[PDB]
Structures are given as C-alpha cells and as structure tokens.
C-alpha cells in the first residue's frame, strides 16, 4: 500500500520549501496531502506564489495517521506552525506512534515550540539556528539533510532537493529515491 | 527602475520550475507576473501542485513589454505552450527587441514550435533533446545552463536554481545574483 504524506501549509511558507517536497514525493508514488492551517482557501507564500491546498488541515488530520508529516520553512510559516494546536496534537500524536517527522529551514522551529523530539540531532537554516537553539533541547548539526530518531531535518531552498529525496529514502527505500533521482538532473 | 519578469504558466507545468524561478526572481527584486495561459483560473500542475497565477496572459501581455520571458517546463505544460498563439506572438515581439527569452527542460521546445532563436545553442532535459533536435535548427549543449544570443536554457527541476541565478545575473548582475544565492544554502 502507498505510503501517505501529510504537508502541512501556512500563510508565509518557503515556497520553494513546499513545492519541491511535494512534487518529488508524488514522482515515488507517496500519496501527499496538502493541508492548509487555516482552512481550504489559497495560501499565499513567502514570495507571494499563492498554492491552493488540497484540503484545509482540519478536514486531512482526520484521515490520519500519515507515514510522514512534513513541515515547510519560511520564517512566518514556521511561525504560524509554532501557534497553532492542531499542528501540536499531529505532531504528538505522529511522535507517539514513531512516525517520521520532516522539517525544513525555519520549519524545525515548531517542534521547538512543540516540544516534539527533544534529545535529537537536527539542523536549521543557519539564520534560525540560534531559535531552535534555545534552551539547548536539540543538538545542532550542518548537515544539508539531518536525521536523529524521528527527526528528519533540512536547512533551506537549495537543500530541498535532498530533503525530499531523504524523504523517499526513508518511506519507499534508497532504490526508489534513486530512481527518481535521475530524471531530475541534479548536480 | 525594476526588472519585470513574464512566466506563462500553463496546464501540465512542472511545478518546481515554475515555483523556484519566481521565487529566486522576486528574491532578486524583479517584479514577476505569474500568467496564466488559459485565463485568470488555477493550474494544476504536472504533479498536481495548484498555483492561482497573478494575471491571465491576456492581460499580462498588455503590460509588456518584460525584460524577461520565462517558459518553465512540463512535457504537457511545454505542449500548451506550443499550441498558443499568444505565446508565439509575446515570443516574437521579446525576440525582436532583442529582450531575454528564457526556458527550462521542456520548455525549450515551444520555442521550437514558434520558430524563436534559431541558430542558437539551447540545452534541454535529456529526454526532450529529440524534440528540440527535430530539423536541426539549434546546437545541443549539455550545459545545465545553456545561453547564446537571446536564449537562456536549462534542463530539469535540478537545474532551476542554476537558470534562476542565471536569470538574476542577465538583469540584475553578478553581485545580486551572488547575494540572493547565499541564503539558498545551495551546494
Ligand atoms: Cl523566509
Ligand atoms: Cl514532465
């Protein structure tokens, strides 16, 4: 059976952040939701691409659980992610059942501000390193792509890809994420 | 006064190079109109990602002339593309006022079908070299990012930032192009 991605998106997202993710999770077969904060109206992103989502979040976390949840960057994404309850009880609730958790640039601010996975190794975009440094919860890496337990953790637009392709790896195997690797062109 | 970039974005398009050009381009100050080939509604992507575009190209095309045109790519996106004659005639007035024309991995290929750059060496994805190649009325480069004359070219969602940059610095210059780079955490 296909594995299932759960995106979860908010006014201020990277868009680049959002996208990329997507797209290369549905090249390997995942099925991905994408999943407004604030309901099923478009978003409107960092650089102002405005996505319409495939459902709001209210309605997705109902046919939870996902194999994944992922978390975008973008400063005021992660922050609107940091402030709302329903993204905490996902994270909670993916934790508890030792489902991945995935996320990207200012993204990891969040499981900061849920307490989720503490004790781990994560990385960040550089400039939200000293956020998701207080307190000292987590263990700070610069690694493009970072994995601790149930962390998976990425630092920006230009780590996107490796992000996704971790993803992959992590869901469906290193063969597929090759395999959908190469039609991509990367370096 | 500001760079203005054009992107057509039709049915079918590949989301990531879509979303990273417009993206890194509004990062780099140029003031970008997402256009929507068909009219002022959603597109669905190629890999189902939903972009609502700034403008139709109806309208978009009345506020040219753009120091850009930018066609992402998308087999069935570079298709529509080709098909229009909107396209072919915002094509032709860039091309005769030796403006940039910009296209990525399928992309190319409606240049192509709009007779634009002829004689010009153009890279595309692997798997649209044939396409492209039909007629022998361009030199194929390997290049991630190819430019010659008026025609900036790149090959797949891996090389988008790669075109993007290349983008900024044709505008913007080198150093803006360099100073937007940074905060991507590119390799
Ligand atoms: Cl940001
Ligand atoms: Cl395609």
């Known amino acids: 059976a296909s ?5 979860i998106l908010a006014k201020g997202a990277e868009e680049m952040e959002t996208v990329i993710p997507v797209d290369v999770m549905r090249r390997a077969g ?10 099923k109206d478009p978003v409107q992103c960092s ?9 709001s979040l209210e309605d997705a976390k109902k046919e939870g ?17 940091s402030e709302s309850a329903a993204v905490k009880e996902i994270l909670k609730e993916q934790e508890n059942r030792k489902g991945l958790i995935a ?20 990385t ?13 919860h987590y263990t700070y890496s610069e ?13 920006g637009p230009g ?21 959908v690797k190469a039609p991509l062109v990367l370096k």
Request: net charge neutral; hydrophobic share 45%.
């Open 3 to 7: 594995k299932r991605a759960l995106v």
């Open 30 to 39: 995942i099925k991905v939701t994408v999943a407004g904060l604030a309901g």
């Open 47 to 55: 650089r102002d691409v405005v996505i319409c989502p495939d459902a």
């Open 65 to 81: 659980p996902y194999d994944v949840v992922v978390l975008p960057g973008g400063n005021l994404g992660a922050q609107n992610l």
């Open 103 to 122: 996320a990207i640039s200012a993204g990891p601010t969040a499981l900061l501000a849920h307490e989720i996975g503490f004790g781990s190794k994560v």
């Open 124 to 136: 960040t975009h550089p400039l939200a390193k000293d956020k998701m440094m207080n307190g000292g």
């Open 143 to 155: 690694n493009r792509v970072e994995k601790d337990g149930l962390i998976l953790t990425s630092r």
């Open 159 to 179: 780590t996107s890809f490796e992000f996704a392709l971790a993803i992959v790896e992590a869901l469906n195997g290193k063969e597929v994420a090759a395999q």
